[PDB]
Amino acid sequence: TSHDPDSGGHFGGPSGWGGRYVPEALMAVIEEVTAAYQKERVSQDFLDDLDRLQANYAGRPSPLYEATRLSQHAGSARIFLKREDLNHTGSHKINNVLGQALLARRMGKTRVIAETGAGQHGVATATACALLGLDCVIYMGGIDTARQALNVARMRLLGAEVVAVQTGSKTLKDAINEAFRDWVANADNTYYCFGTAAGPHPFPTMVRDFQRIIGMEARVQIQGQAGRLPDAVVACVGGGSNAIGIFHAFLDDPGVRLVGFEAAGDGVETGRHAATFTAGSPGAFHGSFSYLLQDEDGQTIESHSISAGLDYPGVGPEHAWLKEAGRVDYRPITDSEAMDAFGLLCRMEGIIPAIESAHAVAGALKLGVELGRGAVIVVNLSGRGDKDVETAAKWFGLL
Amino acid sequence: TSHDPDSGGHFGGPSGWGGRYVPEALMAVIEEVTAAYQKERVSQDFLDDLDRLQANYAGRPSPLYEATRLSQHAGSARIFLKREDLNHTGSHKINNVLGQALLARRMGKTRVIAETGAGQHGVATATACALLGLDCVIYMGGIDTARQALNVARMRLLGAEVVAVQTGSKTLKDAINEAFRDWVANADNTYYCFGTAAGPHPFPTMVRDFQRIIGMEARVQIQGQAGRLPDAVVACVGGGSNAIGIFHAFLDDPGVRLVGFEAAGDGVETGRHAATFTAGSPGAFHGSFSYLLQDEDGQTIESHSISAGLDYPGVGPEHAWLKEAGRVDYRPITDSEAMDAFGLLCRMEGIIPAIESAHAVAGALKLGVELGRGAVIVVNLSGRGDKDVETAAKWFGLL
Amino acid sequence: EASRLGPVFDSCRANNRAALIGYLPTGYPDVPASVAAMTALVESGCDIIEVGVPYSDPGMDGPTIARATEAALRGGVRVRDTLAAVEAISIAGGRAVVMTYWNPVLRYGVDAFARDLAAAGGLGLITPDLIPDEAQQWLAASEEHRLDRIFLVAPSSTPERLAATVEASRGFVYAASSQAAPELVGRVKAVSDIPVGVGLGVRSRAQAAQIAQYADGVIVGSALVTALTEGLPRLRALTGELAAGVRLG
Amino acid sequence: EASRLGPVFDSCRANNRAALIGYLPTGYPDVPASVAAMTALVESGCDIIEVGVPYSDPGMDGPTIARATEAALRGGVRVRDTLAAVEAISIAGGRAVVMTYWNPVLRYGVDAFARDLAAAGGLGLITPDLIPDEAQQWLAASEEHRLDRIFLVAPSSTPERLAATVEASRGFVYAASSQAAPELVGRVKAVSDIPVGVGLGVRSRAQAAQIAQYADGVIVGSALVTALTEGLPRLRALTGELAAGVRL
Ligand SMILES: C=C(NCc1c(COP(=O)(O)O)cnc(C)c1O)C(=O)O
Ligand SMILES: C=C(NCc1c(COP(=O)(O)O)cnc(C)c1O)C(=O)O
Ligand SMILES: N#C[C@@H]1N[C@@H](CO)[C@H]1c1ccc(-c2ccccc2F)cc1
Ligand SMILES: N#C[C@@H]1N[C@@H](CO)[C@H]1c1ccc(-c2ccccc2F)cc1
Ligand SMILES: [Cs+]
Ligand SMILES: [Cs+]
Ligand SMILES: [Cs+]
Ligand SMILES: [Cs+]
Ligand SMILES: [Cs+]
């Protein structure tokens, strides 16, 4: 409870980061979800139900693997990969989805809706809804359906309706807008399973609470395998769920550096990027006061990245607060840097990461050079790269 | 042990299952591998290395999951899924590969070759060779390269060379023939990482010893979760590695029924199947005396299945021995039955299986109706369905 | 003191009618044509104009309004163009309020936008994604610069939130949404005498007249945009029919 | 008292030359043409004929033989066509052994195949995928029906396994593969006086002559199939060229 926001959802003061920048038409169901979550987060029978699925269905705990063959590209630092790539569905997204789907059943909701960019949240939601007998509708940007087509097909086999969004940039922010419109119209029977650590309260806190397990496990594992707490813990940052998940357990370890890596695309100087903390500024977007990419008038600037999961011009408010506090540093990583790391990890350790995760790997290599020989860096390997194989094969001239 | 063959590789004494039906040109390297396996299986360094990789790299143990939403489709029996689909690379193949790849390096071999049908053994082999820095060449039938194309691109990303085999049926048996010819020529420097529980001694025993971990985990897990040993344990059977892996720990429990399910393609009456025990007979093929599909003169008959992994007219010699003894029963499952079960597992449990593993689930559903309410059936869920999503989406009209 | 829009509703209620409240987005189909269109609304009998600020991600706008705001943003429309539109409306004898999503107001500066809106003759602000829970700065700027504050209520609104939203509003409460609309207005009237404007996708005289039985104002948006797309003469005719609808005797 | 092929190698060793051992596969290009080709080999001066049994998965066969056996199988060739080929060779005055992978023999019946091979006038069996370790049934069948058993040795063969393979062979040893062929033949001569045949992808007269300097037999196959594909006269011409080669 120490790092939590107030009852209005604000971090850092009653008018600080987070809150609820939503229409009055959503407030009944937002308050309903908030009350349900406050009740269930302190129920042992709920936490038991979530734990039992995490262990037997999702296969937790995920392991921590020392990637020794990266060391020479990381200044002889020691890169430890937290293997969320080995979860059911292939990403950290399932952690949050199991919690929220269990909550939707507890609330008596029969219909679940979700947004997705990379398709990993969409697949995770479809999976949980099939498992729990819930009707499922996934909203996905049209550009993302084309570049993450393996995940579209998976969602459809799992029994979900997939709706391609043609508005705006046809990517994650626009999928979110459509899902929001659905929820406004269907609040009575519909639960909105939001897939990142952003949005109006209670979502940043709830999503973070269900992803906390990553960091809790990693903190035990690294002390066991390296003999001490790490010099750093790093992750990529889309809306911020996998990062906040692994970071949270180390927040009160003052010797542990925390670094979030954001998608810089073609470069931060080009205007084709998603580097929200590097190039953005504070504002109200998708339910929260946080950082976003915006112009002089406050219009959202469309993001770009080779990674569909990091192609988002906003970021969660807890990250904004942690940035302002001086606790986490956030830094750009380009498409090229990420693909060099994607390729290195395949070649050296035999792990095909998500392109999202390859940004974190790329960042860890640079951090390794900065910190030097024997520094212990834990990296959240947020997901696997099967959805990205076609894109990566093309990038490396392999068909 | 009670279940091991003699020093020549024969199971069951004068039935003569197994052995070595190979040219003298291969016997120097076959004897080399046999000796190196016998030395390394009792070396604590080797077992520590294998164990470290199984835990931290591959993600063992795999969980055992009670699929309660399947129960009504299986005569109210209790289906437990042994989740080999959650292993690194997405199948059981990785278990055998880490063992054999560590062994290749211990022997001082500088090149690894393998055959693949579904592409999972290919991907696992490529994975281990990336990890250990060995040159890797995977042989894959040309029909398999087309229908399992995701795995071809993964192999190439992992640094493995892939050779498309265009001879015979252009499927797994033909890939095995080509890899055999490579080994004959390059024996002095090359290790053959054979991916199933067939071949000349020592491969059937060695592959089974590396896959035994599945059944040892399953036996402990089912007693923990259900409070007793199962009524049955079931698996699909290609060459036989996942089946023998899960079965082995239950061989000496007399009340545990063991059922292997083989691919029947368009149906056993059609001449377009891979139903080796149902329609085949004893013979020498691919290095062993076992069962195979063969005509009146002993020419190998080409197999057919929608599943690339089960599309093999042979079967491993330990299975021939267990069939002879009456310890295991082997039953046919058609393409249609397998795909029905594929779809059902998707909608009920949110798990997209390999089409290989779908044959075992289909058989389990039928066995549940025979055994009745409350019967406990452990099904080896050998792989995930990433590679089969296009085939299945086409099958169900989802495009 | 009395709300800025108080005199309009008092005047309408004395003539046994509802106020006609007309929405157009600044910059559609371009900036000059939109100003001409808003002037036409004043001339054709709109009591109040909602000057829409086009936003990149307008979650509460329907398809007709969303396509039009996209077109405005492609034309290069700015927030200061909405202030110019309000000036033009004030010069023409009209009465303007601005409807905007909150972030353009934050980026401009809440106090500064309230100052400049009041300077242009603007009477208030309609805030579809700002709830009173987050409205501390806006309430301060609203009192300082004498601007009305029109929050929305919905049929799903709980008793507690409806009472708090009406209490926080000045000028009118926007009842956004079939018997839902009269029931929602009925709930607002049970706790307060503030005027209630009703939005219901109105497109004809008959619908405007139905709403004027129970509501103090009739809000029309989508149908004005559709009318303007056809042409300025079509907008004048439609506004004239809606102005006839709001009157009862 | 002695092997079936022993008098052929002694007759060669008395005329100061190596034996020419000719391989053709049964049923290529069809069954009647293949038998007419095998008769042509007897006339053109082949001392021993290897009658190939086409197999569906011929692991050790090179591309020329593999494609010919594939074609014979498409054409419907049967194991009994081989025994008919052995009989036609034996009536023509030639000496025939059968080369086959092991599964066709298992399927037929090991004893029954030996019996019927012997009744056709066959002198022995070449077994490329049968090592002595698995040859218990064959050893017994071989002894009873008086058939030579030609096993293969390789450059890679360990000393122990080379000794065991040579000891298990009657008739000759098929030494299959720079200086590897003469070195392998040398290692067999160091532990046994059994004849050694050498198969080295022989194409020409000069190549057969080089091999005849150290080997008791020169084995040709690939080149004979290539010759038959162009024509039956081209096979006669080549076989006559190789006949002259082994006398040098
Ligand atoms: C937006 C989506 N995915 C984001 C994602 C991310 C970034 O999202 P976070 O919410 O910052 O964790 C990282 N890694 C993987 C494997 C991902 O799939 C999605 O699949 O809907
Ligand atoms: C032949 C290959 N796979 C077979 C396979 C099988 C059948 O092979 P077994 O050796 O019978 O387990 C079952 N399940 C999965 C997921 C498989 O991939 C291959 O990947 O090369
Ligand atoms: N009206 C209004 C707002 N214009 C848009 C953004 O400013 C729209 C909006 C979109 C999405 C959300 C949202 C995101 C995550 C979880 C739940 C949510 F509701 C909220 C608001
Ligand atoms: N000559 C000969 C045999 N004709 C072929 C058919 O059986 C060929 C063969 C092919 C493969 C194998 C094999 C399989 C698995 C592991 C190791 C192996 F060597 C053995 C023999
Ligand atoms: Cs971002
Ligand atoms: Cs490229
Ligand atoms: Cs695990
Ligand atoms: Cs490699
Ligand atoms: Cs089989």
Short mmCIF file of N, CA and C in Angstrom, two decimals, chain A residues 55-59 63-65 69 83 86 88 127 130-131 133 150 153-154 156-158 225 342 346-352 384 386 389 392-393 396 398, chain B residues 55-59 63-65 69 83 86 88 127 130-131 133 150 153-154 156-158 225 346-352 384 386 389 392-393 396 398-399:
data_model
loop_
_atom_site.label_atom_id
_atom_site.label_comp_id
_atom_site.label_asym_id
_atom_site.label_seq_id
_atom_site.Cartn_x
_atom_site.Cartn_y
_atom_site.Cartn_z
N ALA A 55 -0.02 -21.03 -11.36
CA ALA A 55 0.86 -22.20 -11.22
C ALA A 55 0.55 -23.29 -12.26
N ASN A 56 -0.70 -23.74 -12.28
CA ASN A 56 -1.11 -24.94 -13.02
C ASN A 56 -1.54 -24.71 -14.46
N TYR A 57 -2.06 -23.52 -14.76
CA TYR A 57 -2.52 -23.17 -16.10
C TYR A 57 -1.44 -22.38 -16.86
N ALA A 58 -0.92 -21.32 -16.23
CA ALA A 58 0.07 -20.45 -16.85
C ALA A 58 1.52 -20.91 -16.66
N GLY A 59 1.78 -21.84 -15.75
CA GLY A 59 3.14 -22.34 -15.53
C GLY A 59 4.13 -21.45 -14.78
N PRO A 63 11.38 -18.69 -15.14
CA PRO A 63 12.75 -18.73 -14.65
C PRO A 63 13.56 -17.44 -14.91
N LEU A 64 14.73 -17.36 -14.28
CA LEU A 64 15.70 -16.31 -14.49
C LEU A 64 16.94 -16.97 -15.10
N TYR A 65 17.30 -16.57 -16.32
CA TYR A 65 18.38 -17.19 -17.08
C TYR A 65 19.53 -16.22 -17.27
N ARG A 69 26.47 -15.48 -22.91
CA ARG A 69 26.96 -15.20 -24.25
C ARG A 69 26.58 -13.80 -24.77
N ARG A 83 12.21 -14.60 -17.64
CA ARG A 83 11.67 -15.25 -18.84
C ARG A 83 10.13 -15.27 -18.92
N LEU A 86 8.20 -17.44 -21.61
CA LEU A 86 7.77 -18.81 -21.39
C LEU A 86 6.37 -18.97 -20.79
N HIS A 88 2.22 -19.04 -20.66
CA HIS A 88 1.10 -19.37 -21.53
C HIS A 88 0.69 -18.11 -22.29
N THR A 127 -8.04 -16.10 -24.59
CA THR A 127 -7.68 -17.30 -23.86
C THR A 127 -8.44 -17.41 -22.54
N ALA A 130 -12.26 -17.90 -23.09
CA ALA A 130 -12.56 -19.27 -23.48
C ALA A 130 -12.54 -20.15 -22.23
N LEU A 131 -11.48 -20.02 -21.44
CA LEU A 131 -11.33 -20.74 -20.17
C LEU A 131 -12.49 -20.53 -19.20
N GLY A 133 -15.63 -19.12 -20.05
CA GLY A 133 -16.94 -19.12 -20.70
C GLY A 133 -17.56 -17.75 -20.88
N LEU A 150 -0.57 -13.47 -37.14
CA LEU A 150 -0.58 -14.74 -36.41
C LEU A 150 -1.48 -14.62 -35.17
N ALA A 153 -5.35 -14.58 -36.07
CA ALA A 153 -5.82 -15.96 -36.29
C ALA A 153 -6.02 -16.76 -34.99
N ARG A 154 -5.08 -16.59 -34.05
CA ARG A 154 -5.18 -17.22 -32.73
C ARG A 154 -6.42 -16.79 -31.95
N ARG A 156 -9.15 -15.61 -33.17
CA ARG A 156 -10.32 -16.13 -33.86
C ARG A 156 -10.58 -17.62 -33.57
N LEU A 157 -9.51 -18.42 -33.50
CA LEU A 157 -9.60 -19.85 -33.09
C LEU A 157 -10.07 -20.01 -31.65
N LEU A 158 -9.61 -19.12 -30.79
CA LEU A 158 -10.06 -19.07 -29.39
C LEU A 158 -11.52 -18.63 -29.21
N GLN A 225 20.73 -16.62 -7.42
CA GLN A 225 21.69 -16.93 -8.51
C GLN A 225 22.92 -16.05 -8.53
N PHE A 342 17.55 -8.07 -31.08
CA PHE A 342 16.70 -9.20 -31.45
C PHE A 342 17.58 -10.28 -32.06
N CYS A 346 18.77 -14.20 -30.60
CA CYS A 346 18.55 -15.42 -31.40
C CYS A 346 19.85 -16.19 -31.61
N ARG A 347 20.87 -15.47 -32.05
CA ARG A 347 22.15 -16.02 -32.48
C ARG A 347 22.98 -16.60 -31.33
N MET A 348 22.99 -15.88 -30.21
CA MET A 348 23.87 -16.20 -29.08
C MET A 348 23.23 -17.12 -28.05
N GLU A 349 21.98 -16.87 -27.68
CA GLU A 349 21.30 -17.65 -26.62
C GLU A 349 20.17 -18.56 -27.08
N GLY A 350 19.87 -18.56 -28.38
CA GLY A 350 18.76 -19.34 -28.90
C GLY A 350 17.39 -18.96 -28.38
N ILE A 351 17.18 -17.68 -28.09
CA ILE A 351 15.86 -17.18 -27.65
C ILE A 351 15.39 -16.15 -28.66
N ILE A 352 14.19 -16.36 -29.20
CA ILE A 352 13.58 -15.42 -30.13
C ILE A 352 12.65 -14.53 -29.32
N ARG A 384 7.80 -13.66 -26.23
CA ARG A 384 8.48 -14.33 -27.32
C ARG A 384 8.10 -13.74 -28.68
N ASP A 386 7.38 -15.12 -31.82
CA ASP A 386 6.73 -15.89 -32.89
C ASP A 386 5.84 -15.05 -33.81
N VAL A 389 8.23 -13.17 -36.27
CA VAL A 389 9.16 -13.97 -37.08
C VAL A 389 9.20 -13.51 -38.54
N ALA A 392 10.95 -10.17 -38.72
CA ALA A 392 12.38 -10.36 -38.44
C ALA A 392 13.12 -11.09 -39.56
N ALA A 393 12.52 -12.14 -40.11
CA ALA A 393 13.08 -12.85 -41.25
C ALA A 393 13.31 -11.91 -42.43
N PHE A 396 16.26 -9.45 -41.72
CA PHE A 396 17.59 -10.07 -41.83
C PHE A 396 17.88 -10.77 -43.16
N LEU A 398 16.12 -13.25 -44.80
CA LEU A 398 15.94 -14.69 -44.69
C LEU A 398 14.58 -15.11 -45.25
N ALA B 55 15.92 -26.32 -15.84
CA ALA B 55 15.26 -25.38 -14.94
C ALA B 55 15.26 -23.96 -15.51
N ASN B 56 16.45 -23.37 -15.64
CA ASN B 56 16.58 -21.95 -15.93
C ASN B 56 16.35 -21.56 -17.39
N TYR B 57 16.56 -22.49 -18.32
CA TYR B 57 16.49 -22.19 -19.76
C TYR B 57 15.18 -22.67 -20.38
N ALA B 58 14.86 -23.94 -20.15
CA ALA B 58 13.70 -24.59 -20.73
C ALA B 58 12.41 -24.40 -19.96
N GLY B 59 12.51 -24.02 -18.69
CA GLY B 59 11.35 -23.76 -17.86
C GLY B 59 10.71 -24.95 -17.15
N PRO B 63 3.73 -27.66 -15.94
CA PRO B 63 2.63 -27.92 -15.02
C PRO B 63 1.72 -29.03 -15.50
N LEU B 64 0.91 -29.52 -14.56
CA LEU B 64 -0.17 -30.46 -14.82
C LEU B 64 -1.45 -29.71 -14.55
N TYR B 65 -2.35 -29.64 -15.53
CA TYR B 65 -3.56 -28.79 -15.45
C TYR B 65 -4.84 -29.59 -15.64
N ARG B 69 -13.41 -27.93 -18.01
CA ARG B 69 -14.39 -27.62 -19.07
C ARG B 69 -14.43 -28.67 -20.18
N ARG B 83 1.57 -30.16 -19.45
CA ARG B 83 1.71 -29.02 -20.35
C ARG B 83 3.13 -28.85 -20.93
N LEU B 86 4.22 -25.55 -22.86
CA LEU B 86 4.83 -24.37 -22.22
C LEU B 86 6.37 -24.38 -22.16
N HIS B 88 10.26 -24.03 -23.32
CA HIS B 88 11.01 -23.28 -24.32
C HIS B 88 11.00 -24.00 -25.67
N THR B 127 18.06 -24.05 -31.53
CA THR B 127 18.13 -23.45 -30.21
C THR B 127 19.38 -23.91 -29.42
N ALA B 130 22.65 -22.84 -31.03
CA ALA B 130 22.89 -21.41 -30.79
C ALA B 130 23.52 -21.22 -29.42
N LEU B 131 22.88 -21.83 -28.44
CA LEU B 131 23.30 -21.79 -27.05
C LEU B 131 24.72 -22.30 -26.80
N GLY B 133 27.06 -22.97 -29.44
CA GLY B 133 28.01 -22.56 -30.48
C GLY B 133 28.44 -23.68 -31.41
N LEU B 150 6.44 -21.38 -40.43
CA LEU B 150 6.83 -20.61 -39.26
C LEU B 150 8.11 -21.18 -38.64
N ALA B 153 11.43 -20.47 -40.60
CA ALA B 153 11.94 -19.12 -40.38
C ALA B 153 12.57 -18.95 -38.98
N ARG B 154 11.99 -19.59 -37.97
CA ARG B 154 12.61 -19.66 -36.64
C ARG B 154 13.98 -20.33 -36.67
N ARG B 156 16.05 -20.55 -39.16
CA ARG B 156 16.97 -19.68 -39.89
C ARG B 156 17.40 -18.49 -39.00
N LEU B 157 16.45 -17.93 -38.25
CA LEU B 157 16.76 -16.86 -37.28
C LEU B 157 17.70 -17.33 -36.16
N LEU B 158 17.55 -18.58 -35.76
CA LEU B 158 18.42 -19.19 -34.77
C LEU B 158 19.83 -19.58 -35.27
N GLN B 225 -2.12 -33.60 -6.84
CA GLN B 225 -3.38 -32.89 -7.16
C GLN B 225 -4.62 -33.75 -7.01
N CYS B 346 -9.36 -25.31 -27.82
CA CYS B 346 -9.34 -23.86 -28.01
C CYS B 346 -10.49 -23.14 -27.29
N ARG B 347 -11.71 -23.64 -27.46
CA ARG B 347 -12.92 -22.99 -26.93
C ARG B 347 -13.21 -23.23 -25.45
N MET B 348 -12.78 -24.38 -24.92
CA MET B 348 -13.07 -24.80 -23.56
C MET B 348 -11.99 -24.38 -22.58
N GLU B 349 -10.73 -24.56 -22.94
CA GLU B 349 -9.61 -24.29 -22.04
C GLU B 349 -8.70 -23.15 -22.46
N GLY B 350 -8.96 -22.52 -23.61
CA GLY B 350 -8.10 -21.46 -24.11
C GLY B 350 -6.69 -21.90 -24.45
N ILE B 351 -6.53 -23.16 -24.85
CA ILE B 351 -5.22 -23.71 -25.19
C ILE B 351 -5.24 -24.14 -26.65
N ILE B 352 -4.31 -23.60 -27.44
CA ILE B 352 -4.18 -23.95 -28.84
C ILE B 352 -3.12 -25.04 -28.93
N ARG B 384 2.42 -26.84 -28.54
CA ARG B 384 1.49 -25.75 -28.84
C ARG B 384 1.31 -25.57 -30.34
N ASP B 386 1.01 -22.67 -32.48
CA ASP B 386 1.62 -21.60 -33.31
C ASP B 386 1.80 -21.99 -34.79
N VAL B 389 -1.63 -22.79 -36.82
CA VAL B 389 -2.73 -21.82 -36.80
C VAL B 389 -3.33 -21.58 -38.18
N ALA B 392 -5.37 -24.82 -39.22
CA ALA B 392 -6.59 -24.89 -38.43
C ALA B 392 -7.59 -23.78 -38.77
N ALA B 393 -7.11 -22.56 -38.99
CA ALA B 393 -7.98 -21.47 -39.43
C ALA B 393 -8.60 -21.76 -40.79
N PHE B 396 -11.35 -24.59 -40.16
CA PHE B 396 -12.57 -24.00 -39.57
C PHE B 396 -13.18 -22.79 -40.32
N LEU B 398 -11.89 -19.68 -41.08
CA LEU B 398 -11.65 -18.44 -40.35
C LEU B 398 -10.64 -17.56 -41.10
N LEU B 399 -11.03 -17.11 -42.29
CA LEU B 399 -10.16 -16.27 -43.14
C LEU B 399 -11.00 -15.40 -44.07
#
